[PDB]
Design a protein around this ligand. Structure first.
Ligand SMILES: N[C@@H](CCC(=O)N[C@@H](CS)C(=O)NCC(=O)O)C(=O)O
Ligand SMILES: N[C@@H](CCC(=O)N[C@@H](CS)C(=O)NCC(=O)O)C(=O)O
Ligand SMILES: N[C@@H](CCC(=O)N[C@@H](CS)C(=O)NCC(=O)O)C(=O)O
Ligand SMILES: N[C@@H](CCC(=O)N[C@@H](CS)C(=O)NCC(=O)O)C(=O)O
Lengths: 207, 205
């Protein structure tokens, strides 16, 4: 059994996507980010960075005590290694998959997140910052598009945790002042993943 | 033989740290970020995100063609898996190590980088943005400090790629307007890593 500490956000959806694709049983535990649920002492023991997603794995491979883990990328990697699913063991595909996973964690997520912040959450309109993250958002979509023009999926011929990590952020394009049609390979890939049954199951759970 | 495409930056130093700690032979290939070396077509083939670090591994495990890789975190993980060094195979320590490695890549690096930008590189002074990333930098140091109060190293009892990923960023604490003495466990950990012989070799280049 996996407990998933969750809020309906791009980083939360990464994990529901994986769990639905892998067919793992899990319990969704809602953390109310608006009311400071992420700062509760009992939650900080699981997620000392005060963020979701976090999991608690009640059946770890070593047969021991529940295993807690935060960082969506570490969770995806952990679950992929545990299940043998959505991450290749072959060195080339595995390397390419990890490359794009870390690119999402270090680039796509953080920068699109700043885009969201300065456009929607900041109490003042700051054109320099808005422009900075807008240009960077476009750069990232351009990089993503160029890769997806060259391969069906980010890591190679198989859907993987790299695609799973990127999709919920691309799915938020509507908030990012991006025209997704300007990136046709991203658009088609986004649509393709949206049409997978597990993706629909994950979104319905978010409700 | 590993080719390392490099600039003297926190992310560049992650990989020299690893290579020196692991005792791997490598060639340093300088990419001039100031002159747009990261946009050269031949380099974009290796690093399509137009950034350093990137490596080319000329003796990959599969015996095949040179293997190119970008993202400092993927490079660390790749080299750790290849060598068996600085990443545990035991499931608990491995999970904790990966947790803090991803935390660095998604949090410490990006936010301290924004701190650097708005304080030193931006052509205008933007107090809201400076404050946002200052506060977040403080938060990240507080999280890092708390973990280091509870464990000698980020992933457990052993130095790992998680520590290696974080250190060059902490080593830039002066640029971040952070008082490292406010984070005593970070301060001691920073001093400890600085004193390791490989660290000195990496900085010396
Ligand atoms: N790098 C982290 C980012 C996680 C993250 O940003 N979580 C947000 C929700 S999407 C959060 O919990 N924010 C709470 C807060 O900042 O107080 C990951 O990939 O898991
Ligand atoms: N404390 C955050 C709250 C907002 C938040 O957590 N945003 C998430 C998206 S739900 C984010 O930007 N995560 C960045 C990432 O995933 O790396 C802020 O001020 O930006
Ligand atoms: N997430 C990336 C970040 C790498 C990065 O920010 N590289 C900088 C140097 S530290 C770079 O090459 N900048 C060139 C540019 O942005 O044009 C990683 O961990 O490797
Ligand atoms: N294009 C970058 C140029 C400066 C740069 O590459 N900064 C690196 C540090 S050398 C950075 O902040 N990387 C963020 C990370 O490592 O995630 C910018 O405008 O911020």
């Amino acid at each position: 059994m996996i407990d998933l500490y969750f809020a309906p956000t791009p980083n939360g959806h990464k994990i529901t996507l994986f769990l639905e694709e892998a067919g793992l049983d899990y319990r969704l535990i809602k953390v109310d980010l608006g009311k400071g649920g992420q700062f509760r002492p009992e939650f900080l023991l699981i997620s000392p960075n005060n963020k979701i997603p976090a999991i608690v794995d009640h059946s770890p491979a070593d047969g021991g005590e529940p295993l807690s883990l935060f960082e969506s990328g570490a969770i995806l990697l952990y679950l992929a290694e545990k299940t043998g699913l959505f991450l290749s063991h072959e060195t080339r595909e595995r390397a390419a998959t990890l490359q794009w996973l870390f690119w999402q964690v270090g680039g796509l997520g953080p920068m699109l997140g700043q885009n969201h912040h300065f456009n929607h959450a900041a109490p003042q309109t700051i054109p320099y910052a808005i422009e900075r993250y807008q240009v960077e958002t476009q750069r990232l979509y351009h990089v993503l598009n160029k890769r997806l023009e060259n391969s069906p999926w980010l890591g190679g011929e198989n859907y993987s945790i790299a695609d799973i990590a990127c999709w919920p952020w691309v799915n938020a394009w509507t908030r990012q002042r991006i025209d997704l049609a300007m990136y046709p390979a991203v658009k088609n890939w986004h649509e393709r993943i949206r049409s997978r049954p597990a993706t629909g199951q994950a979104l319905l759970k978010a409700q």
